[model samples]
Target: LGIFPTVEKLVEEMREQLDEVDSHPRTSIFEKLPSKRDYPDYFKVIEKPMAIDIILKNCKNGTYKTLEEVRQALQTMFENARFYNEEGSWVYVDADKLNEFTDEWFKEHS
Candidate 1:
């Protein structure tokens, strides 16, 4: 009901695309939020931490009111990755790849 039904369907499609990267060995590390215990400085460094799982949860919980909000969430996910990981590192490279893919997906879908 309301705009959420459309928004949820869009998020579902976006999740399908994200599933591709989520299943990849190299980029799969981004599937979930980093554990504070595993990376002690993570929460301290990233002001707005985001991940695929968190995005999905946000959509389900009605936190996202528009597709643009969801798109920004996806952007924040990779931006956080790039901010935390070193340039040219595997994690950074994978995050860039995912970011590009999401950008292209949004362009086509929008």
Candidate 2:
């Protein structure tokens, strides 16, 4: 198929292709890419703020038993995390905030 794609049209096509790849079980892209909540159990990314809060609470209570626990909790914060602003259309997790949370967490137990 000879198709000339405009920038917007190509972006739209890319989004569609991403959806298709995400839905297919055999596609290894699932492993290679960051995943949303719709992905497999391990790769699922939670909402940014909520994920941060969850980890913070777990630390506040000494609920996290080990560093591995903290690491696992942190993993959910990445890979397909959705925190879109209606105006900006995209938002990012603050890595510094996460680091702060992690520091407070470990400092509590350390």
Candidate 3:
């Protein structure tokens, strides 16, 4: 018989069941959890200041009103960042060269 009164209540009942499971003689995946940092440089960061900044700064800039435009821009920027962040392309600037050639006309300044 399940201790939970209903499926909705299972999550609430899970807290008490956890310790009893720990007492059972069995291996746990938690035992393998990052016992040591082998590749510290590639260690995943749960928090990202730069990613949050990009999301928020664009939000406040009225990008939310133009969803497609914003999504396209983010896809471009992040794909570029992903490429450039790689050890080989460290010096590549996101869309900078494409933009540089765009300065040939007066329509951009106007």
Candidate 4:
């Protein structure tokens, strides 16, 4: 989503990722974060970091829809994210997984 192309498509893809996280049936990666103890804010810092960047970059810069490319992108994002998450890691939480309770209203209404 830049002075390049397909910004709307990027938005659609973003919604899909959000749907995946939002519609998950089990414990969120966030809920499991503290257990990993790799960092205190593993969700904001790690998991979501990898997931978000890959989603954005793939959708925006690259048109990779396959799992492998997505995986690579996520790894790269994770590396960047980890820097922000941990010492010698990320300076801040760049990827955010802000799922809301009302987001589930669709589940209830539908």
Candidate 5:
């Protein structure tokens, strides 16, 4: 094997991390994009909405050329959630948790 991981391997690792986030009870709300009809203001407030599934799709399709792109996507996802939801809301709190979790995962894995 090469000294550094291939892009495919990096993508797989990212997918695994996102899967962990998706399955977690607290952060599971970020598994998919929120319904626009339910939260009409979401589209207006979040210029670039993102979610675990969306990031996974990008990884699978090779849209992310580097691991940094995946990390940015995850960051955007959490930032969008925190921006759209109130500070004390469950979604906002969970977003913070997921953001911190992802940061640690990338620190060790990437």
Candidate 6:
């Protein structure tokens, strides 16, 4: 004889299983996954470049007469561009090179 449990029955059963698991030592279930370093030497920051918008709205106001002039302006601005990460509160200088600095800092302290 077999029976299909109702939603409540299923939920209770799930909770029982969770209780059984939770009773065990946390370390028993915790292990590092097979992967590279938590932070790679060359990590990518993917987000809207606030710098682009700033340059466009404030600098690109139809003032330049030629494409070369536009190029020069952009070159001067982004030649040594440094932007801040909105969420991480980390300042990305020299195009994400500073990631190494933070990663090492964490490694030493943590």
Using TM-score as the measure, the top candidate is: 1
Question: What's the TM-score of each model vs. the native?
Answer: 0.76, 0.30, 0.26, 0.28, 0.73, 0.23
Residue 81 of model 2, lDDT score: 38
**Model 5 residue 42 CA deviation in Å:** 1.0
Encode model 4's per-residue lDDT on 18-98: one tens digit a residue. Answer: 325336431123221244556566555454444443355555455764444544554455365445555431122223332
Error of 1 at 87 (Å): 0.6
How does candidate 1 score on lDDT? 0.72
Q: Higher TM-score: candidate 3 or 5?
A: 5
Model 2 TM-score is: 0.30
Q: What is the C-alpha local distance difference test score of each model?
A: 0.72, 0.38, 0.32, 0.40, 0.69, 0.30
How much does each candidate deviate from the true structure in C-alpha RMSD?
3.8, 19.0, 19.9, 12.4, 5.1, 23.4
The Cα RMSD of model 6 versus the native structure comes to: 23.4
User: What local lDDT score does residue 30 receive in model 1, on the 0 to 100 scale?
Assistant: 66
Comparing 3 and 6 on lDDT, the stronger one: 3
Q: Judged by lDDT against the true structure, how good is candidate 5?
A: 0.69
Look at candidate 1 and give me any clashing residue pairs: none
> What is the per-residue lDDT of model 6 for residues 5-94, given as tens digits with 9 covering 90 to 100?
221232233223222333532111111211226734213442322232333333335554443443343343332334322333222232
For residues 1-110, could you state the per-residue lDDT of candidate 5 as single tens digits?
A: 32124434543444443334446465467778879999788788788888766766776576765678888887888888888789988788777766776687677757
Off by over 4 Å in 1: 1-27
Better of 2 and 3 by lDDT: 2
Looking at candidate 5, the ten consecutive residues that score lowest on lDDT are: 1-10
Query: lDDT by residue for model 1 over 1-85, one digit each (tens)?
Result: 6445554565455445443444644347666887889987999988898876677678768797667888898788888888888
80: Cα error in model 4, Å: 0.5
Error in Å for residue 83 of model 1: 0.9
Residues 1-110, model 3: lDDT tens digits: 22112212321222222223334211121112232257344235322212323433455556433434434443444444454354444223322322232222223322
